[PDB]
Design a protein around this ligand. Structure first.
Ligand SMILES: NCC(=O)c1ccc(F)cc1
Length: 330
């Protein structure tokens, strides 16, 4: 089997991407944030505290003839931005782009933190990291991908995120029309539950490539590119007036600037992130100070190849017995 679904930016900055997902019978379509940095499929629901729901579409398990309470199961997750959610668990039929999994754990939120409530466009998350990170207790549950894997034509999914435009998540096949040149594959460590890999270096603009190992995760659920402070300083030093602002919480730059590209290495190959991709716009409405799309990972504890990096590439998440990651230009 295969599936193919379009993923769409939630706003004009590409802060996140949503993909429609069918849950239950008859189908209830929710727009979920596909997140290769976590492993829970959770949704706003009829059980979510009413004051914490603001415009989201909810899953109502009592209206699904295939929903079954997973008795005794609870979940609770925190994310890197300090947001969180928790609740109980149903199993139900879940379909993405024509690919169906029966008996998928659908984690129903009883509580969500303010950032989720405030984002009307995201109805939940669909985790695509390794199932070892799944938070369901006392019986850990499998991701949608893990459940689908054995049935797929090939045990892979691909992320093809757009810059200020829709893109595609495919399951079970590689669309050879969706990228230019070849796909370069690179080793993955699953020890921390993430799609963790090692970039071979970077360049700023037209500058010389610096060969240096940068361990990090491929994370569709993180907006920005978070790299070591040395690398990030070298980038922003090429932008007149750019500075790290403790008050704002990262590098800012004059909105009048023209940003250089940023290249990262994948083996001997190179992925170029255009300068425009690194612009996240005014820090507040009407400001002439703009927020940078490349930020320091210092304090996070890991480097994160988030959407800023991934949307410059066609990315293969290869879930074969020994997982790997592939990157192609597009
Ligand atoms: N950096 C990822 C992160 O903080 C996040 C936050 C919320 C979420 F639902 C997914 C990801």
């Amino acid at each position: 089997s295969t599936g193919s679904a379009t993923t769409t930016p939630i706003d004009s900055l590409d802060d996140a991407y949503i993909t429609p997902v069918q849950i239950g019978t008859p189908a209830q379509t929710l727009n979920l944030d596909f997140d290769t940095g976590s492993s829970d499929l959770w949704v706003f629901s009829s059980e979510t505290t009413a004051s914490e729901v603001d415009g989201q579409t909810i899953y109502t398990p009592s209206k699904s003839t295939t929903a079954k309470l997973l008795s005794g199961a609870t979940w609770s997750i925190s994310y890197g931005d300090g947001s969180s959610s928790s609740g109980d668990v149903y199993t139900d039929t879940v379909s993405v782009g024509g690919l169906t999994v029966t008996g998928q754990a659908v984690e129903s939120a009883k509580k969500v933190s303010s950032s989720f409530t405030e984002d009307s466009t995201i109805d939940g998350l669909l985790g695509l990291a390794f199932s070892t990170l799944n938070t369901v207790s006392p019986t850990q549950q499998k991701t949608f991908f893990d459940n689908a894997k054995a049935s797929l034509d090939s045990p892979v999914f691909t992320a093809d995120l757009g810059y200020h435009a829709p893109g595609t998540y495919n399951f079970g096949f590689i669309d050879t029309t969706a990228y230019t040149g070849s796909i370069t594959y690179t080793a993955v460590s699953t020890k921390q539950g993430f799609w963790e890999w090692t970039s071979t270096g970077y360049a700023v603009g037209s500058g010389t490539f610096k060969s240096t190992s940068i361990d990090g995760i491929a994370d569709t659920g993180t907006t920005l590119l978070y790299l070591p402070a040395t690398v990030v300083s070298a980038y922003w030093a090429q932008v007149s007036g750019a500075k790290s602002s403790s008050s704002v919480g990262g590098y800012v730059f004059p909105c009048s600037a023209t940003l250089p590209s940023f290249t990262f290495g994948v083996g001997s190959a190179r992925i170029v992130i255009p300068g425009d991709y690194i612009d996240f716009g005014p820090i507040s409405t009407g400001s002439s100070s703009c927020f940078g799309g490349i930020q320091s990972s210092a304090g996070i504890g890991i480097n994160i190849f988030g959407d800023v990096a991934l949307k410059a590439a066609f990315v293969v998440f290869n879930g074969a017995t020994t997982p790997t990651l592939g990157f192609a230009s597009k």
